[PDB]
Every structure is written in C-alpha cells, then in structure tokens.
Amino acid sequence: PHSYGIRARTRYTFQRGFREHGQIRLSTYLKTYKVGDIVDIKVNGAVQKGMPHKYYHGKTGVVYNVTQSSVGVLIYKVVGNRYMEKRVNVRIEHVKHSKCRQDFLDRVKANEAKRKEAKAQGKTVQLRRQPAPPATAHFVSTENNEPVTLHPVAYDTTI
Amino acid sequence: KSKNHTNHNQNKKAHRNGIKRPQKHRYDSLKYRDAKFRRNQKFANRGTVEAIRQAKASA
Amino acid sequence: IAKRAESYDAEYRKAEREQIELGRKARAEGNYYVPDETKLVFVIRIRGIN
Amino acid sequence: NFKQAANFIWPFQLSSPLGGWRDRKFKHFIEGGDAGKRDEHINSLVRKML
Amino acid sequence: ALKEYQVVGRKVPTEHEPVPKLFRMRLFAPNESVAKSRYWYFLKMINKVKKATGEIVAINEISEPKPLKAKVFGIWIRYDSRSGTHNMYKEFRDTTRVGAVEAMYADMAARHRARFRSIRILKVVEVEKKEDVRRNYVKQLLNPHLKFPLPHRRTGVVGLAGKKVFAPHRPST
Amino acid sequence: GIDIERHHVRKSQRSKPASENVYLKLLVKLYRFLARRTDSRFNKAILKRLFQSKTNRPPISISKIAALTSRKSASLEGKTTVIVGTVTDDERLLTVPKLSVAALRFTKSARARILKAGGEVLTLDQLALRAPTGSNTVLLRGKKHAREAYRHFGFGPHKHKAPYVRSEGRKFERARGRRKSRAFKV
Amino acid sequence: KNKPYPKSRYNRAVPDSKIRIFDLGRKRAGVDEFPLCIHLVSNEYEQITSEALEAARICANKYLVKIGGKDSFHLRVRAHPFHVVRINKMKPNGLVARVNIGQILMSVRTKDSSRATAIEALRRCQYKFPGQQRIIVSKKWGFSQYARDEYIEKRSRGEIIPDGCYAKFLNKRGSLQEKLDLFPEASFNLA
Amino acid sequence: AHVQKKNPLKNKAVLARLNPYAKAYKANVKLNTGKTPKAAGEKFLTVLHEN
RNA sequence: ACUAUGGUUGGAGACAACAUGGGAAUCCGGGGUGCUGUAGGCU
RNA sequence: GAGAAGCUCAGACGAGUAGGCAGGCGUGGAGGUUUGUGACGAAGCCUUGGGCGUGAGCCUGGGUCGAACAGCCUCUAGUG
RNA sequence: UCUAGUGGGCCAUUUUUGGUAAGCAGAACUGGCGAUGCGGGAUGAACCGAACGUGAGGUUAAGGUGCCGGAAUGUACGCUCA
RNA sequence: GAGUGUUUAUAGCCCUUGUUGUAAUACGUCCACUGGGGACUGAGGACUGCGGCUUCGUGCCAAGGAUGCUGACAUAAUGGU
Ligand SMILES: [Mg+2]
Ligand SMILES: [Mg+2]
Ligand SMILES: [Mg+2]
Ligand SMILES: [Mg+2]
Ligand SMILES: [Mg+2]
Ligand SMILES: [Mg+2]
Ligand SMILES: [Mg+2]
Ligand SMILES: [Mg+2]
Ligand SMILES: [Mg+2]
Ligand SMILES: [Mg+2]
Ligand SMILES: [Mg+2]
C-alpha cells in the first residue's frame, strides 16, 4: 500500500488556494534573481513544468544558476548521518525571494547608519540586538481605577 | 516472519557522528552553470588575469 | 579591593532601602508599586541522568 | 561582563539537601513538589545544599 | 499550613486599552507562589488573560483581625466528585478564617475523598447572628451554659513514662 | 552519574618517533629541549615532524628546492632550506645552483651535486647551532599525496580514481560499467 | 474504536439501522405550548447502538402516551447511528452512535404541568442505554436557543413569528421592507 | 600550592586573605532611631479587609 | 475547543481534574464597499 | 642525579555483550650475556608455614627427591 | 585510511491500524533491556529512583518507620464493621 | 423557683476611634555577632605563597594538609593466616 510516484501524497500540497485558481499574477515573471539570492520554494500546481519534487516545497535555499525561465537553487537535505548538497532546477513560478533577506539587508544598513553617526558624535553605538529583558519597575495608580474583588463562581447547568 | 522494518534506532545512529555538514568552499565548479555563461567567463577571467599581470609589471 | 567592596555594600543596602521606601509610599497612597523583575536566576538540576 | 564572569565559575557541586526534599521531588513546586520555578524559595533550598 | 493572601493583578496594558482594570482576590495558599498561581487559575476562567499577558501588582498576607475571638465561619464551595460538580455550604467554628479553611479541606478529604485540586472556595464569611447558623451542631456551641465531659483520648502519661514498655498497674479513669 | 559526551578525548598525534634509530633519538632530545626553552614555532614544527612516519615525511628533490627558493618575488636568495626528510637529486636539472640545505638525509647524488655547485649540506643538529630558532629559514615539505596509494583512495562510482588491477589492458576492468556500450559508464 | 467508518462508496454494503423514526408526539406543534424541555444527556463517551436507541424510543413512546396522551409531548431522538461496527461472519455488522460527553440523547418538550412526568419517562430510558446519563431541565424554550425570560420579552414585544413547530426570530439584517411587512405588531424603533 | 581548601566562612584568617573589607564591615546598623511613622493609608486598609 | 510537557494524580474503565506552557474555528455584533503606477486628453 | 624511556605540579573522569586496540603474565626451543644455581642436592612433587602483585603469576620455610637448571637482552613456536 | 562485529530483537509511555479478543500481529515518538549492577515495587530483563574504580564520613532519591525490619504503637480532623 | 420583659445595674461581652507608643510578641530575613556537645579524617614532608599581628626582626599566628603532653603493655596488644 505504498506507491513512490513523484507526486504521491501531494493532494493538498500542490493545490491552489481557495478562490486562487486561474490566472498567475504576472509580477512573478518580472522578479529578478541573481546568484547568491536566498529564495523560498513554493510549488504552483498550475505550472506542471519545472516543478521541484515535493521534498523541496516549503524549503529555502541559495540561487546558484540562472537560465531563461528557471533558477538553480542549492538545498541541503539530510540523507543519513550528513547533509547532501541538492541542486534543484525550478521554474520561477515556484520561487520567491526570502523576505528575511531584505530584513537582514536593511538591519545591516541601519547598523552602519547608526555606527557612522555614533562615531561622529563620539559616542557608543550599541548595535547588538537583545532578548526581551525582564520588565522594569512601574507605579500602577488606582485613582478612578479601584480594584474589583472577584470570587470563584458557583456551578450551574447552562443547557 | 520477515519484512521487519523500523526507524527506532536509526535516528539515534544518525546523531552518533552527528548530522555532518558538507565543507563549504570559496569556489564551486562551473560545470553546474549554463554553458554559455561558462564559456564567456573563461574569456573574461583570462583578460582580467592578463590585465592584472601587465599593470603590476608596468608599475 | 577593600574600597570597591565597601561601595558594593553601600550599593546593595541603598537599593534595598529604596525598595522599602517605594513600597511604603505606594501603601500610603493606595497605589501599587510593581518591583523590578529579576535579572538573575539560580538553577539547580534535580533529576539524574537517566 | 556577566557572561564571562558566570562562565568562569565552575558549575557548583552541591550536596544533597540536609533535611531532604519534599515528599515527592518530581512534581511542580506549585503542586507541592520540587521541580520548576520556586521564586525566593531557591534560597532556603540552597542553605540545605550548600 | 495555609495562609490567606490578597492578590491584585491586571492585564498588561496594550494600545487598545491602556488602562486595564485591576482585579483582586482573597486566596488561601501555603505560600505566595501558590497564591499567584491560584490567582491566574481563577482569572483565566473569567477574563481573557494569562500569566504571559498579565501581571501581579500586589500581594499581601492577611492576618486575622481577632485571633482570640471564637467565631462561626460559613464557607461556600464548589467541588468536583467522581461523577459531577456540586456547590455545598459548610460551617465551622474557629478563631481564624485560615483555621476554618484548613478544617474544610480536611473535612472534604475525610467525607468525600475530595482533593485540593477539586475544590473551589466561593466565599468565606464570619456569621454574626445565631439564627444565620444553618447547622445545629454549630449553634449548640453558642449556648452560654454549654457543658460536656472530656472527650475520649488514650489517656496521658507525661512524655517519658509513656515511653515505658511495662506498667506496674492497670490504668484507672 | 555525569552526562559527559567524549569525542576528542585521547589526542591522535605521535608523542615520539616509532623509529628505534638511536641518532634520531638524539635529534629528538635536542629538539625537545629547543621547542620547550624557546618561543619559536619553527622548533615545535621540527620536533613534531621528527616523530612522523615515512609516508608522512615525503622526500623533496634539489630541483624543487631550487625552484621554491628562486621565485620572482622570493627574497629567499641566501637562506637555508630545511626539510625533515630526505633530499633527493633531480638529474633533469643539468646545472645545480648554489644552495644551502638542512635535511635528515641526503642521497649520495644529491649531496655530491650540492657541494660541487658550491653549496652546503647540514644535518638538523648543525642547523640548530646556526639558526637556533629557525630565523631566516625556508621550512619545506615534500608532496604527501604523490605516493601510489592516493591514486586509489576514494575509488567509487564517478570518483575517477584508479582501480586495483593485477594487469592493465583491455580485458582488465574496461567493460560493463566502464563504458556506455557496455550497460553503463561508472 | 477506530476512526469513523460511515456508509460511503467505499462502504456501500451496509445494513440499515434498526431505528428509522426519530420524531414523536405532536411533531407539528407550535411555540406557545410545550414551553418546558427536559434533556437526557450522555455523561461519558459511549457507543449506543441503533438497537439500543430503537429499544429506548419504543419504550419512551408507549409509556409517555399512556400516561399523558399524544398531544402533551414532543419526544425526539437526537443521537443518530452513523458509525459502522464490523464483525467476522459466523464485514459490517451494525450501526452505532458515537456520542461525546454531554451529548443529548433524547429531548422532550412538554408542559410545565407535565414536568414530573417528563422526568420519569426520561429516567426510565437510562436502563436501555449503556453508560451513564443524567437528566437536566433545559433553560431554553422548547427547542429554541433563547432563555425563558428573553423569549418572553421577544414574544411580548411582538418579534416572533410562528412557523410550524419552530419559528422566525427577527434580526438586524436584510431589506427593511420585508422585515416590516413580516412583523406587523413589532416596533422597528428608530434609536 | 593549595593542598587543602579552607572555607572562608569558617576560617577567619582565610576570610581576611580574601575580602580585605571584612574587618571594617559593619553589620546591624540602626536606622529606626526616629519616630517611626506608620505607612498604611486609608484606601489600602479598606481594600485589604474587603469580603 | 484543541494541544507540548508532569505526577507512585483521580477513576474498574471510559475519561476527568489539576500543574508549567501554546491557543483555534464557527456564529454573532459593529465598521467598510477599491487603492494605486506610467503616459496623455478635458470648463 | 634521579633509567629525559627520567623528574615534577594540577584538573576531570571510571557500566559493558559482540567487537577493536594496548600493556603485561606463563610455556618448549635458538643467539648473547650473568668469575649465574647445583650431588654440601638440579628438576619435579607435597605442605595443616612466610612474603609480593588489582590480576595473569612470582619468591620463600619445612618435607620428599636424585642430575640437571635459571635471571637479563634478543630469536622462535606444535605456547596457556 | 584500513578493518571488526552486526544485518532474528524485545519492553514501557504516548499516537495508532488489523483483530471478537489475546501474554496477538503491524507501523509512529521517546526512554529502556539486549550490553545495566545498585536502592525500591515480598518476587520479577524493561515499572519507580539511580546508572557502578578501591575505601572513610556526611546527606539523600524512589520507598518506608506495630513485629518480622533499619526508622514516630508520631501529631491533627474525620470516615468505615465486612 | 420558671417564664417574662427593660441596655449596666452589685456582672460581663461585641464594634469604632485618642496616648504610654518607635508597645510587645510571633513569623520572615540577614549579621564578614557570639557560646557549647558528638563523630570521621591528618593527604603533604627543609625553604619559598597570600593574609594577619608585631617590640618591625631571618619575630609571632589557627595564614600553601597534626602536633603536643602522658600512661600501660611488651609468652600482652595490634596486624596476618
Ligand atoms: Mg537527619
Ligand atoms: Mg520522597
Ligand atoms: Mg497529557
Ligand atoms: Mg516519570
Ligand atoms: Mg570499563
Ligand atoms: Mg615444541
Ligand atoms: Mg630440590
Ligand atoms: Mg592440599
Ligand atoms: Mg597487594
Ligand atoms: Mg596447540
Ligand atoms: Mg526497628
């Protein structure tokens, strides 16, 4: 009871979203991909050509090659006791840029914007992110906000 | 009875010598690239090396 | 080293007194002083290795 | 420099608590056990273990 | 050893409501950690708040104002049995609300095999008038001319000669 | 109990030569002292290589020494070349330049040709006297992976390594699995 | 006790459940009458078979009719046998109902005068069912969703339109003109 | 060097080697030398005794 | 509602409660009923 | 000096079948060495005595006995 | 880099499928036994606790403290007669 | 001698506020505050260190690990088998 055809068990994985069938938005074809870009793989069931295998659906990797209609994407997959370099040729309908990559780009930009300004003002810059610190001391007032005393409620059937 | 598959110890075995990651190199083989890109890159790189050689020598 | 130790002692005692004074002030006014959350925790392992 | 200072300190090798633990160690402190966060009661436990 | 605490807490302020309301409970717990945990247990079933999205702003132990005055304590509880949920009312004579509450927990353990987790204390009130006492076994203790013999204990022999294995004579009541 | 996982527990290196050569023991004695009583990485390098096996101490020829010390941007003009190993001759180098070399062993032909060209040959103890910390020295090694076994290591499908075969020619592993006309290629 | 296994194209060869009638009494009643509802709820997760339900409904119909008649009750069976229990023949064997905790098994709305009678009939059916069940009195009007106090106010304002057994409850949604005409006595107050 | 660990909390000479400040350390300072007011408040006490 | 984690917890079991955490759907109610780029026309 | 194959200071750690490696113990025979042991008692054997080693094993008192035998560095195997 | 053993597993928790059920068969996750002694569960491969060099002292876990048996015929409030 | 029916009488109780208050006490927490009883251990072996105290000196100390003072036995005792 187990077939190993390419698209076995992809019944929901390769479905277009509800009320998202039909036309493919043409901005997908106008995106530019360069070697070193970090892309997400997300299979469009409406484009049967250039389909990556279902293992790569929802995976993120680096573009190593650019062709007319496709990109080569480097993906590491565990195959035992080690990761293996996989090179998947994907048509650009199944690919999108990682949104964190622009977030990392902008954070670095803001880091150097802070660093240069801190240098000129002759002060520290403190470019390190920090985990959410313990909450600080405050002074909750009760004027016009008097405490309400609660009690546990008695049991009663609501059917 | 044969056909006795189980994955119970297999994950433990994989982690004994860990999930190894492949070595990352500065340069990857251009045999994975488009052949037209690869052919022209040979000429571009050859000219860059020639130009770097001349400028050092003529300095 | 002795001078540094003395200043640390004064610092610990000063922080402790301010906590008492802030709590007393809040009780007097009927408001609430929410103290600073701890920055330090000590962790003890209570289970063996099985 | 907490990170460098704390890491420099070898993990403390405490004894078993003088006076023992609560009846069942391995339920939560809120449930009358010993596991998990116990707030300032970590100090009484350390006295027995130090 | 239970203690009574007042606990005051609130939802952490957000942009939608920057002045969340303050809610107070009186809770019987062995320590402050359990008191705060019980506060969030009871607040979660009334308000859309968790410990992660709330904060405790005050906690104070409440001592008994008149620990030397014998009182009558009426306690309303809600408890889970093996088959269902019930509300019941019990009355206890004590000098502290803590003492009555400890009496109630022992009483529910003995008579219904009800554990601590299965009991919610709805209210603890000091009953002032004689007729408001609903149990006769309690209001008979409010008689000025109340008299009874000493209850049957296993006698008493100091602390040391009670450790003696052999006695020269049989005991006499 | 303690939960310690131990991977790099025992050091994997030699702490002494496997050789029983008494004179090698004397050289180790000299360089144990020098590597301990100086701050020189050169002396620790010599001590470590004095322990190594024959396969880990490949030879180097005087041609390679002459080439390595005569690069266009070298400045390795009048400096002593040092190898913990054998210095062989390269008869293809018809004219040997003037070289200063310190080595464990010199081949008879290598030693004769170095001297005849006005150069000098030193043992490692003579080197220790001249440059006790290896200053202004070219420390060199032979090619570790030039030996035959490295033609074969890693043989496998599409690895382009050499097979172990008793004989070479057609009929000796050039058929099914080695060409497209016979099932598949490698 | 596997995952639900109903009749389907993959399970065409199925027996019919032994109960086919789920509605009894004055099924075509109204909203003014039968104002009090009693429910028999399942207290545990049981697997009441169609035989056990069929037995209960026959017993409930006979006792209730003899004691109060036909016009004073609206007995209905909430549980439906849709799970198929298999067997090896001497393959599907029977139909059972998977009821969770607090699932109503039989609901009867009667007069408040028949409050004691409705309790007793619903009490007897516990001997036919497996597991444990409890008798509770609904806080809702008959088979509606509203409390008796609220339903009275909706009835006194004039926003309730009787439609067979059930009814139509006004809402602040849809074209006004249809809402106006349909509710004659109701006051569409202008705020 | 260091053949036997000595607890500074028990060995006073070792406690002097570490912590030079221990000699001058003054515990049990009296700060309640004044009139000692009471800080409870009317609102606090009426909230405290509710129910 | 569901759920990760916990107990020599309850219960014959079915399940349930509690403890340290995560946290819906649906219905119902209020509000809304296109925004925008390029290039050029227009009392 | 401290068999530099030596000397010295410190810290952590310790289950193990199948299996792997290292360092040792014991046996027959070979080269070398030890002004080696021995009819004034070799080897072997017995022991209700002693000593050494974590152990494989080793040394020794007493008894019996009668012709050979051992230590150290190496070689070797029909070696427990 | 070279090479050994192995290629019959089994138990528990939790998620399950088949089966009337099973000390049943088959899969998922983790911990175990196999290769794990020790304290506890009278007993016991797998449950609880805890994983082990030879020892001195101290303190504990799980579990106990009428006697067998080391340790309160301890304290407090009830319930229960079989 | 049993029942009433009025708020200190010839008693008492409950609930509010003033001081003599910096009341005590309990509990919690801390003291580089302090006083005793019991047991196991004594690794190391010239010196060197960090401290303290000093009459400032190759001095003293509880400060990089036990010494001191006594007694009895010695075909006993302790060890071994
Ligand atoms: Mg004790
Ligand atoms: Mg315990
Ligand atoms: Mg669970
Ligand atoms: Mg457990
Ligand atoms: Mg071992
Ligand atoms: Mg032989
Ligand atoms: Mg003899
Ligand atoms: Mg014998
Ligand atoms: Mg020994
Ligand atoms: Mg043999
Ligand atoms: Mg005993």
UniProtKB/Swiss-Prot annotation, chain A:
This is Large ribosomal subunit protein eL21B. Component of the ribosome, a large ribonucleoprotein complex responsible for the synthesis of proteins in the cell. The small ribosomal subunit (SSU) binds messenger RNAs (mRNAs) and translates the encoded message by selecting cognate aminoacyl-transfer RNA (tRNA) molecules. The large subunit (LSU) contains the ribosomal catalytic site termed the peptidyl transferase center (PTC), which catalyzes the formation of peptide bonds, thereby polymerizing the amino acids delivered by tRNAs into a polypeptide chain. It comes from Schizosaccharomyces pombe (strain 972 / ATCC 24843). Signal peptide: none annotated. SUPFAM superfamilies: Translation proteins SH3-like domain. The keyword Glycosyltransferase does not apply. There are 2 genes for eL21 in S.pombe. Its main location: cytoplasm. Pfam families: Ribosomal_L21e (PF01157). It comes from the Eukaryota. It is found in: Cytoplasm. Keywords: Cytoplasm, Ribonucleoprotein, Ribosomal protein.
From Swiss-Prot, chain B:
Residues 1-30 are annotated as: Disordered. Gene3D superfamilies: 6.10.140.1730. Pfam families: Ribosomal_L29e. Its main location: cytoplasm. GO terms for cellular component: cytosol; cytosolic large ribosomal subunit; nucleolus. Component of the ribosome, a large ribonucleoprotein complex responsible for the synthesis of proteins in the cell. The small ribosomal subunit (SSU) binds messenger RNAs (mRNAs) and translates the encoded message by selecting cognate aminoacyl-transfer RNA (tRNA) molecules. The large subunit (LSU) contains the ribosomal catalytic site termed the peptidyl transferase center (PTC), which catalyzes the formation of peptide bonds, thereby polymerizing the amino acids delivered by tRNAs into a polypeptide chain. Belongs to the eukaryotic ribosomal protein eL29 family. Component of the large ribosomal subunit (LSU). Mature yeast ribosomes consist of a small (40S) and a large (60S) subunit. The 40S small subunit contains 1 molecule of ribosomal RNA (18S rRNA) and at least 33 different proteins. The large 60S subunit contains 3 rRNA molecules (25S, 5.8S and 5S rRNA) and at least 46 different proteins. This is Large ribosomal subunit protein eL29.
UniProtKB/Swiss-Prot annotation, chain F:
This is Large ribosomal subunit protein eL18B. Component of the ribosome, a large ribonucleoprotein complex responsible for the synthesis of proteins in the cell. The small ribosomal subunit (SSU) binds messenger RNAs (mRNAs) and translates the encoded message by selecting cognate aminoacyl-transfer RNA (tRNA) molecules. The large subunit (LSU) contains the ribosomal catalytic site termed the peptidyl transferase center (PTC), which catalyzes the formation of peptide bonds, thereby polymerizing the amino acids delivered by tRNAs into a polypeptide chain. GO terms for cellular component: cytosol; cytosolic large ribosomal subunit; preribosome. It is found in: Cytoplasm. InterPro entries: Ribosomal_eL18 (IPR000039), Ribosomal_eL18/eL18-A/B/_CS (IPR021132), Ribosomal_uL15/eL18 (IPR021131), Ribosomal_uL15/eL18_sf (IPR036227). GO terms for molecular function: RNA binding; structural constituent of ribosome. GO terms for biological process: cytoplasmic translation. The keyword Transferase does not apply. Pfam families: Ribosomal_L18. It comes from Schizosaccharomyces pombe (strain 972 / ATCC 24843) (Fission yeast). There are 2 genes for eL18 in S.pombe. Keywords: Cytoplasm, Phosphoprotein, Ribonucleoprotein, Ribosomal protein. The modification Phosphothreonine is found at residue 133. The modification Phosphoserine is found at residue 135. Its main location: cytoplasm. Belongs to the eukaryotic ribosomal protein eL18 family. The gene is rpl1802.
Curated annotation (Swiss-Prot), chain H:
It is found in: Cytoplasm; Nucleus. Transmembrane segments: none annotated. It comes from the Eukaryota. Coiled coil: none annotated. Residues 1-51 are annotated as: C-terminal-extended nuclear localization signal. The eukaryote-specific C-terminal extension harbors a nuclear import signal and delivers the ACL4-uL4/RPL4 complex to the pre-ribosome, triggering uL4 release from ACL4 and incorporation into the 60S ribosomal subunit. Belongs to the universal ribosomal protein uL4 family. There are 2 genes for uL4 in S.pombe. Component of the ribosome, a large ribonucleoprotein complex responsible for the synthesis of proteins in the cell. The small ribosomal subunit (SSU) binds messenger RNAs (mRNAs) and translates the encoded message by selecting cognate aminoacyl-transfer RNA (tRNA) molecules. The large subunit (LSU) contains the ribosomal catalytic site termed the peptidyl transferase center (PTC), which catalyzes the formation of peptide bonds, thereby polymerizing the amino acids delivered by tRNAs into a polypeptide chain. This is Large ribosomal subunit protein uL4A. The chain holds residues 313 to 363 of 363 of the full protein.
